[PDB]
């Protein structure tokens, strides 16, 4: 089952390789192995983000 998560708050990337998203955005999970930095896809973009900025959606 393809897992998703929804953005709780906006997240403006500080370093390269980080996924930018607005609150309410639904992100697709690629990697959830590291408890802090998860990797996902948002349309065209792909990158890591703070897990404490999202919660499950689907």
């Amino acid at each position: 089952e393809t897992k998703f998560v929804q953005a709780l708050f906006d997240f403006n990337p500080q370093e390269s390789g980080e996924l930018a998203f607005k609150r309410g955005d639904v992100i697709t999970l690629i990697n959830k192995d590291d408890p802090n930095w998860w990797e996902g896809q948002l349309n065209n973009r792909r990158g890591i983000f703070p897990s404490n900025y999202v919660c499950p959606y689907n």
Partner: peptide, 7 residues
């Protein structure tokens, strides 16, 4: 909005 942890 919680603080972003160690990179």
């Amino acid at each position: 909005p919680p603080p972003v942890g160690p990179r």
